[PDB]
C-alpha cells in the first residue's frame, strides 16, 4: 500500500513492560502491525515492537479489512 496503510498518532507517552509491550511517545505515530482484541493493538514505532492500548493512540487509519 504505502498510500493508505494503517497508522495511529500516539496521543500520549506509553511505556510497555517487556518486548511483548510496545513503548511509544506523545507524537510517535505507529504503523500498526495488527489488532489484539479491541482495547489493545500491535505496532512498531521507534524501532520498537509490541502491543499498546488503543485508548492511548489516535487511529488515523484502520487496518486493511477486505
Curated annotation (Swiss-Prot):
Function noted in UniProt: Subunit of the phagocyte NADPH oxidase complex that mediates the transfer of electrons from cytosolic NADPH to O2 to produce the superoxide anion (O2(-)). In the activated complex, electrons are first transferred from NADPH to flavin adenine dinucleotide (FAD) and subsequently transferred via two heme molecules to molecular oxygen, producing superoxide through an outer-sphere reaction.
Taxon lineage: Eukaryota, Metazoa, Chordata, Craniata, Vertebrata
Residues included from the entire protein: 168 to 233 of 339
Tissues showing expression: Expression is restricted to hematopoietic cells.
Disease per record: Granulomatous disease, chronic, autosomal recessive, 3: A form of chronic granulomatous disease, a primary immunodeficiency characterized by severe recurrent bacterial and fungal infections, along with manifestations of chronic granulomatous inflammation. It results from an impaired ability of phagocytes to mount a burst of reactive oxygen species in response to pathogens.
Domain SH3, residue spans: 3-62
Domain notes: The PB1 domain mediates the association with NCF2/p67-PHOX. The PX domain mediates interaction with membranes enriched in phosphatidylnositol 3-phosphate.
Cell compartments where the protein resides: Cytoplasm, Cytosol; Endosome membrane; Membrane
Record's protein name: Neutrophil cytosol factor 4
Amino acid at each position: 500500500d504505502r498510500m493508505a496503510a494503517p497508522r495511529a498518532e500516539a496521543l500520549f507517552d506509553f511505556t510497555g513492560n517487556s518486548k511483548l509491550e510496545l513503548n511509544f511517545k506523545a507524537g510517535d505515530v505507529i504503523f500498526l502491525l495488527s489488532r489484539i482484541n479491541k482495547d489493545w493493538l500491535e505496532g512498531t514505532v521507534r524501532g520498537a515492537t509490541g502491543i499498546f492500548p488503543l485508548s492511548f493512540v489516535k487511529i488515523l487509519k484502520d487496518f486493511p479489512e477486505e
